Amino acid sequence: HRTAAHTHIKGLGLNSSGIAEKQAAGFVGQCAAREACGVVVDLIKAHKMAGRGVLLAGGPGTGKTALALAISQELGTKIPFCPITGSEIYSTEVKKTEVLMENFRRAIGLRVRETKDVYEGEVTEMTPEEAENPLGGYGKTISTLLIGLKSARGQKKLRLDPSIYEAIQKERVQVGDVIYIETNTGACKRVGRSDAYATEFDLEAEEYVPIPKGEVHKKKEIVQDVTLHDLDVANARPQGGQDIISMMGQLMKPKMTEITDKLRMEINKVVQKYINQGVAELIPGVLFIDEAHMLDIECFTYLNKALESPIAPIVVLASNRGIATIRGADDLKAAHGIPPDFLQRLLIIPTHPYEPDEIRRIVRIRAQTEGVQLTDAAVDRVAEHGVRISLRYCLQLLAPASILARVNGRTQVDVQDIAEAEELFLDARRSANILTSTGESGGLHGFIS
Amino acid sequence: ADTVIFYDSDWNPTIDSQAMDRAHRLGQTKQVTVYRLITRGTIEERIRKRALQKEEVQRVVITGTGS
Amino acid sequence: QELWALLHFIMPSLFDSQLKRLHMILKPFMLRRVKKHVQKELGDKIEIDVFCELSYRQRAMYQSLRNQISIMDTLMNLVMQFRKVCNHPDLFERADTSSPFF
Amino acid sequence: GLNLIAAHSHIRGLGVDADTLEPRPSSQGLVGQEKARKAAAVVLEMIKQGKIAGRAVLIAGPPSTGKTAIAMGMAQSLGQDVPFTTLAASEIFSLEMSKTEALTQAFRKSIGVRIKEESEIMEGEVVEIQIDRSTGGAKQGKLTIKTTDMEAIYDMGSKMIDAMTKERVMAGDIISIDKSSGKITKLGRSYARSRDYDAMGVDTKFLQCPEGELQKRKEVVHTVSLHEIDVINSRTQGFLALFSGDTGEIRSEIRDQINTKVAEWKEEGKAEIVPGVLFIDEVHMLDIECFSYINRALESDLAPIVIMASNRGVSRIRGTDYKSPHGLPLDFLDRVVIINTHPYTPDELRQILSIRAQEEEVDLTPDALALLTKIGQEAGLRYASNLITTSQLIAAKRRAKQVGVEDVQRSFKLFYDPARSVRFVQESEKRLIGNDGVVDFSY
């Protein structure tokens, strides 16, 4: 609903033959790059490949991020699209190569069938039974709970292990509540009071709920979408048991941890059981590392090994820089800001500047996307920027000009409202002239160097 | 009753025209309103448009009087 | 043919197996009158259309269901599933108490 | 499966004649690099022989000359018999622990303690479980189990009845019981009882009954690394840190105790020590402090063989301001023998591309393989290998059964090689942001 930089991008706008239509799905031009991004979408949808690298290479404002977000739409919702900047990699909690691995495994998805095996009913009896322990000093302990559950078409009496009674107890269950119990986790949920004895005169603000229909014991099945990283995190910070470690692990502050290769390898074994059991579909996705020049030579040297993994997502890099110094390696210059031995691994999609008539088309697509109804002379005005000034400066003027027109009582933007927008809101270059002319000498009114 | 709400349109307009008659009969005296919850952008729309054009054919085939 | 079957039933000798013909031949056998003429003491019906769009859950059901048209077209099955989600998505998949993947 | 096609998936071993260490011109997915493969096979021999401790080998050569491939070939030709640790040198720059501690843990991971143990396992189909649960529970109960060859009934002790009820063991369930622990694993449901499993969904699998005796001794050969023993001894659930990480810096006196105890188990004959390999990929990412530690870690008796790869020429050593070959200090390089990988000839590129075109499901027409070979000479082995996947996807878009020259040409046109990418950069220097931060956005 809110309008943002890429709201007009809907897809790559390719033909079924995989050729780009010159203006489609919000794009203008970049046709060769849109066609290359199509073949990458094909590489992703065909699950066969791991750890292929793609670089979107081209100057700022050439639509590299529009291409990546268009890929994210051609893949649809099922496939994991995992966007990061290279500046997200420098965590204070864990080494930066941990964050890369977390993002690599966040980019691999799993759809898995799960059977939830549960008991549900109105609690009709609850009777604890206990033993006098030998002198451990903590005193007597509950040995078991007997609990009666009533549903609409049956009842049970359950003799619980005391670890499930602790779930029952920490859930503050009472006689006459409706509860849900998972035999999977031993976990308990208090659903409400019965709709029996639902007298209004409680301060307790209870939700009275109907008796569960059907039998007390149920075995429902549901399909869960998870990433491999979701499994890593669950098993590294255990929280689904009723044991003391799972209990205290919910009270401690959450913190990220440098999950070992040993854990990740053994979760591959676990997930492959789900595949062989036929309960899971593996759905590998894509990791988009925007601003990949902000990675350092330790990140890039780790990506070597990470991409060689027998499962890894597709990695799409974007860079906007020429021959530049590699970060963390001030001795080494290379194109794109990428180490030369890593660049060998990638397929590079070069991305090119727009022509003046393409800029005019983009301005009109963008104007009608923002709902800025805009006269043709006004379009020509805005499209003379983008040629003389960055393309982004065109698109950013459309909103001020709309406000100024509406404040002038116009239904639509004239050249006048842009000519006022051009004056209130400068580009970087006009502002850079103001600096150099005013900071031409120091003083009270100078800009600070 | 004085109000009929169709949660669903039927493929046959005669059945809904019968259904909405239940309130609109010689014993009625309040105004009758009929509401029809056509969910927009769905085949609930095409079902209603097909049923509505059939009612025109059924009215054309009774162009001449039966009186 | 559904009009013939009624006419065959009442008068099977004549009607054993264009509008200017129909309205003449049926003049004896059908009598019809309408509330506009004889029962105009009643008001007319007010028919109000009440459009509402698919909620975000319904359209998640509906669009993933419509995705099957990329493979099939079963269409008479799909138009019943489409009618379910257009009524309430709990008809198609009942929402129920849920928890993370274990 | 969960293993997808990856860059090294075609490597099945080292491709060397085990009787002579003569490298075959191609086998097991390796092509050429014969002298390097022979040397890696001599290293592989003395790894398996175990008698030699803490030697370090560097594999040195230009990028894409098969350095990782040879490392993967050794790993595939050691298999499970020997520990094999792979370390990217970037990994030791932990925030949890100092880099010498991280580098210690990597050495400890590469020595295995091999421990052989037995247990009686009882396995069969449950014919019946009777449990009285007589107010309290677990009072008494009887278990009947059969194989195809025997049937027996057992009176159960009360803590076994708890185990049976905990596992909801049911008639028809195929179970194994480890007797000394008393854990019950339900291996499956017997097919003959399928109709009793009225709660199980149709997705449920079934099995035939177990065969032979209900009870036998099954012998397990565990291998546990010195690192695992170190971490186990750190805290009350130390092993739990082998997964999450969150090991601290493990105290040196814990390791020194463990080294003594493992020497006792060896002398007592209770355990064997199995020296593995640590492979340090792109070792030049280590700094001068790391190399100083490695120098003496290699002199330990419980040191693995360390194998290393470097792309680097005479290059700046990290953490200092002078240059040395491989980017490695000469005092460290004095402790290391070096294996060189050379560039490939055009026919070896053709063979590697052919192998890669077998590992992916691709049919190359003979002219498409010739063109990819030509692109391989001109643009590098890795780029032509990525054109294989691209061409198949283009061919499938035109519904072709085989990849033709037209598909390779589309690939070459759509995706630039590194040199054309650099040339594109060298032309676009005003539009690309320079090292000065300067850029022009105008047309």
Ligand SMILES: Nc1ncnc2c1ncn2[C@@H]1O[C@H](COP(=O)(O)OP(=O)(O)O)[C@@H](O)[C@H]1O
């Ligand atoms: N070919 C195109 N068609 C339509 N809009 C485009 C195109 N290329 C870029 N844009 C738009 O121009 C703006 C700047 O492009 P952007 O993707 O931010 O460039 P980069 O990410 O390379 O700096 C964005 O709002 C983007 O949607």
Ligand SMILES: Nc1ncnc2c1ncn2[C@@H]1O[C@H](COP(=O)(O)OP(=O)(O)O)[C@@H](O)[C@H]1O
């Ligand atoms: N001799 C060889 N036989 C088979 N495949 C090879 C050979 N050399 C390299 N390759 C393959 O080509 C790719 C690049 O080689 P690689 O071993 O990664 O070189 P480096 O590690 O030195 O960059 C890898 O996928 C590798 O499997």
